[PDB]
Symmetry: D2
Subunit: 425 residues, 4 copies
């Protein structure tokens, strides 16, 4: 994990970065695809996974490697692996422990994407996921069984902005001998470390917060390295020596089991590999993640207060709020804030929200979150237009719903902009 | 397709590139993740796929778009889509027309990767692929049936360096109402256009030739737009309106059917999206593809002749050679050459090849092909060490086999380097 | 003009100069191009004539770099900006823009090693003499001014030496003699002090350091305040006398864009110290967090300066904000948000003690840079200022026992802990 | 020294200066960094002292850019190279490296618009006078030489004007007077003519054009032949007299790296026209195909020049290789592989005919650049050389009816077809 016990701010700046022979203080962009092997042994050794080193950029990259380590350090885990996007980090994570005919138990509150994947695409492939209501931790136990291999939820609903009892669902899963995978995109390691509250694997859509400016895509998978793969016995690929990899037992890697299996199977075969550039820009984003998340909260705090007190605001979801049905969860798991993404409904309903959008100057109309620039959009008509009233209202998406992602601009300017706009709907 | 009927050299330089309002002569790197929508309608419109424009970089990118068009133009197809890597362009291509419990008929001669994917990973997902011997076009018909939805082969075996009767297998597939997907990595549009000899879809690993210098990864999928999806009837997802996409019938797009379905399903859900940088470097590579491939052939020609005449060379595979079991295929389908990748066996067997490797100065020991720098490696101990003697000798990988990828250096220097080295094994 | 709807720093550093093209792309595209297609022969001819606004040649204009120009100027509260390859190039251009052969410049003794040697050796060879004055006494500049003097140069915070200067004072003394006031605001950044609003006419920057923020990309920026009469003073003819090469165009006629437009059209076009659109993109990213980053570098440096002052093995510690530094008054008047994150320090054991301290710290990297997100430490006299020797070395506050530290954005405690252990091993 | 195991152009452009780091990465890493961690206080001090080889500061040294230096020099068959931000910056540095105030340069009249105005306006202001001679008669240079003259400058192929020059001739005339011969080989590239091997001492390049090859990235390269006695001639003191700032180091003591090492240590460090490691990476990619690309640009231009000569509506066509151009002899002697892909042409209808032709072609883009993979066309007098007017305009072969064309690597037939249709519409 973290060697000389460094604090978050130090880890987000140094984690997994070494200095090569050139003395280059910044991580070089290893925009290469292959690596020269010392001799014919090392070649066979690297491809056999028995000799530590670079192999192929689809599999390995000195730049991307620093991201794996660094994110893991922040997430306080044991090993990380990066991928083309968040969607791919999810697809890989799932496929690593779910075969055909098997199933997984995932929360009702999910990003339009994560959802339409679990339900339409990966099922089509014979892996259906049973959607439970995250508000009642026990609600998962009811759909669990023998074909179930992992309990999946999002650290903060998208757009349900609903918290969940991490520790509860973690045991409910371990009691049945399966792992807890938490999609921490919305919370980030600075706000919450699912791996330290009952989670085994944490996925991220670095595209959003880790990246920081809406310029780069990428996903990350971090493992806690705290789940006996043999014990539970429910994960064969992990137990049964791999013929294709020289009878290697993934469970023998320990803290690196889950991640070295994605890299050697899913990643190598499906190839949703990140480009060294993207990884570079992620390293820059991480070098300031905390600082930006800190402002993302204090800004959202101020913007939420002003919005709650405005007559023209019907309702406002935001766990930290003293009267949100999740306030208690917030205080227990999110001591530093609940993010900067929130939903709200206006008093003039649907036509009013879109109207507000059409008047704001500092809020951009687009599909994204966690940009340094503030954003707003109406989920139902976009990011979740892949779900019918059936799932739509099941994930909290109502015709009057409007979503906001608070940037790092000046709170006064954002409030002023919001004011002038509402003063016209 | 190609509007004012331009020749290959003109298309590889201009295809799908327009000039924006800035006047920028070079395609800008759109290192962005989202796009600002005009109003709430356009947002809903883009996400509904009813309004042409950018949506999300996982789905769309102005830079990557030029690659889609450009490659397609060269491949002489109707529509292209790019992806994170070649492996992902393959995974996506397959998943676009193969559900669970279904199967596909693919050649025995395949890249270590393409293979271990079709066989271990995608089966695990309940899609097994029956490996036929490409030498006998009829050999495919025997394993075809009702669950079969596509016939897949590589334009040039890796490392079988075996040609195949494109037109033969194309009909053998259309007679049974399925499509022909040809992995043209090794041949490229300048040497062969599978789409014009019985192929419906062509996949590429731009990582290799299109890229040109071993710096960038990426895959491409191009469709010929010449297969009635309704007629054959064997492709439901293409016939049955998509609920998630507003009851859209993929077959209604025509020339853009196959590609807009990968982008809207597999890509959007699995997210093996290319980074705008990678796409940029591909555009540069394409702007010179032909010129480099031209030298790749004339260089390999000269290097093959010298190698055939050297006493210490046991055997040498290279279709163009007057006595290779494929010479006739070569003359019919490859009028401009058969590439620059070839295999050879030495007279001192295994230990001799690796020895040759350990002596060469201008040939680099690594896992890659089509680099401007020349490369050599022993497949059995690396790129195909995922197959047992069973598949290993089934794809032409023998203990004395050595593979070479001819660069663009000076033929005399390469021959000289090879000479001095052989003069020591 | 300037900042339209009167926005605050945090909003400008994130939005300033950034429009949405037809592609609708939210992030600024990286325009890695060298040329631009012109509408017919006239648009082409009119652009090259500088009469038609638009792109011409990346050596002169770039859509990506353009956002940098606007944004940086916006933050620095100026009217126009032009960016260049490095901080050194921005400085070289600023001078050369208003300095011919036979002219002279009066500059502070406290200057970064490069800047010094540029004024003293490189520009000397071309008939541009520079008088190095002691910035502590504003009147000292008056003494060296004369007919050939054409500009007064100072740094917002000496490098090294950490000495502040009376902006308004030197500002007046310069305008009273009809010359411009050039401030190299590198160490301060627009967020700590805006020299253009306290008597300065042109402010240059080394985006390499703070603006970029991670030690990964290089570039310089020149920003003009556009509130200095070029005609009036009369000492800047090129700004008044029509430019033959440019259809008799008179640069002073451009108003708020006179100085920078002269650089782009003269010095920049001809010498070509051009930034690459890539770098510009990375700078934009940096600017998008400038305020947040500069904020921590300071809170961090404050604590670390405290600890280091109380520590027995510390001979002395320069940091203007310290209640008794000979510049404290200048700090309160001009630097309400802090005095940055770069300070010098002397050790009890002299030089050998310092070099010992460097080699033992684990969170401070020994390299030549400042403003990195990572913390840095180095010994100025043997590196950054080794082209000067002792007389000029000592004219800028560089003593053999001097050690320089650049506080990063890591955890303040860890940094102190690291500092402790190293000092004990000294 | 130079090219070790005697390799050919195609092998050098792909391998020259590229090593494999510990990561084993085959492709040259992009070192997007500004500084480098130094081993203890001495390595640091020794690097800054220029006595310890290694990286110092990206403004001075970069592992990515370094491959560019070696490689380009290798191809140009020289001993040492240094790269800079642009072609203009490489030229500016080359001159300033051997030119002080009060010195003069004698250069060809045929110069790219920028180069001209740099010599004539920008460098004039700094006491560096340049005498513009007629390159057609080598003796013409002798006439302007004198005590203050310190270098003879010419382009391998005038821009525009497409005029060749007697390399060896001007080379001797310059060494007979103890001065260097500087050639701007942009238009030719090391693959068509290697000025360093035919009487030249320093050859500069605008990688922006051919080396890069796609109009996407900018940069300049300076290459020295290292076969000119600095001590002997005696006219280059700075090369002989110990450098105080550098521990009395004498630049001439460096041998084959004297000229370029002076640029990196003086002009470059102080003015900072530094390339970005990104650009360098893109240049390396370009170099990896230079020979192949230059080969087609020529076969293509040959055909296109033929067609255009026979065409009725073509008043005249400049291309040295043409059997009757006043430079054909120079072409056969010096350019055995072709004379490039940039030619000028006059139309029967004069200026208006030309500008008409431009606006009608579909495969030729109207922009300011050459050597793109895409074909280009432009009218020099209203753009690239509009800072010069008629007297100096006409001293470089730029006539109001002149049209310039840069042949790309598209299909030769399509280009001709496109040209036909446009001419008919004229
Ligand atoms: O500091 C930051 O937030 C940005 C992220 C990419 C480059 N620097
Ligand atoms: O011409 C070429 O081959 C290279 C490819 C990337 C940049 N230019």
């Amino acid at each position: 994990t973290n060697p000389e016990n460094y604090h978050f701010e130090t880890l987000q700046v140094h984690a997994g970065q070494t200095v090569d022979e050139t003395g280059a203080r910044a991580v070089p962009i290893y925009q290469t695809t292959s690596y020269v092997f010392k001799d014919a042994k090392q070649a066979a050794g690297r491809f056999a996974l028995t000799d530590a080193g670079n192999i192929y950029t689809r599999l390995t990259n000195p730049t991307t490697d620093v991201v794996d380590k660094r994110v893991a350090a922040l997430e306080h885990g044991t090993a990380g692996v990066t991928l083309a996007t968040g969607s791919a980090a999810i697809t890989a994570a799932i496929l690593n422990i779910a075969q055909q005919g098997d199933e997984i138990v995932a929360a009702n509150t999910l990003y339009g994407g994560t959802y339409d994947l679990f339900s339409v695409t990966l099922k089509k492939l014979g892996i259906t996921t049973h959607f439970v209501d995250p508000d009642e931790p026990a609600n998962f136990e009811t759909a669990i069984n023998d074909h179930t291999k992992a309990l999946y939820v999002e650290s903060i609903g998208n757009p349900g902005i609903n918290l969940v009892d991490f520790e509860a669902i973690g045991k409910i899963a371990h009691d049945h001998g399966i792992i807890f995978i938490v999609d921490n995109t919305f919370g980030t390691p600075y706000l919450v470390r699912p791996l330290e509250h009952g989670a085994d694997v944490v996925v991220h859509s670095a595209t959003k917060f880790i990246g920081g400016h809406g310029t780069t895509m990428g996903g990350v998978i971090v493992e806690g390295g705290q789940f006996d793969w043999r014990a539970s016995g429910k994960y064969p690929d992990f137990t049964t020596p791999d013929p294709q990899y020289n009878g290697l037992v993934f469970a023998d890697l320990g803290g690196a089991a889950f991640t070295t299996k994605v890299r050697a199977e899913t990643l190598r075969d499906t190839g949703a590999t990140i480009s060294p550039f993207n990884s570079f820009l992620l390293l820059q984003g991480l070098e300031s993640l905390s600082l930006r998340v800190e402002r993302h909260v204090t800004n959202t705090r101020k913007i939420v207060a002003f919005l709650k007190a405005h007559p023209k605001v019907a309702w406002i979801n935001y766990p930290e709020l003293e009267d949100s049905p999740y306030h208690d969860l917030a205080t227990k798991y999110f001591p530093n804030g609940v993010g900067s993404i929130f939903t709200l409904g206006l008093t003039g309903g649907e036509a009013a929200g879109k109207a507000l959008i059409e008047h704001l100057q500092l809020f951009s109309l687009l599909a994204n979150v966690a940009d340094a620039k503030s954003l707003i959009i109406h989920p139902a008509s976009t990011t979740h237009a892949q779900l019918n009233e059936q799932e739509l209202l099941a994930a909290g998406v109502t015709p009057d719903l409007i979503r906001i992602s608070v940037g790092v601009e000046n709170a006064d300017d954002l409030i002023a902009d919001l004011d002038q706009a509402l003063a016209q709907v």
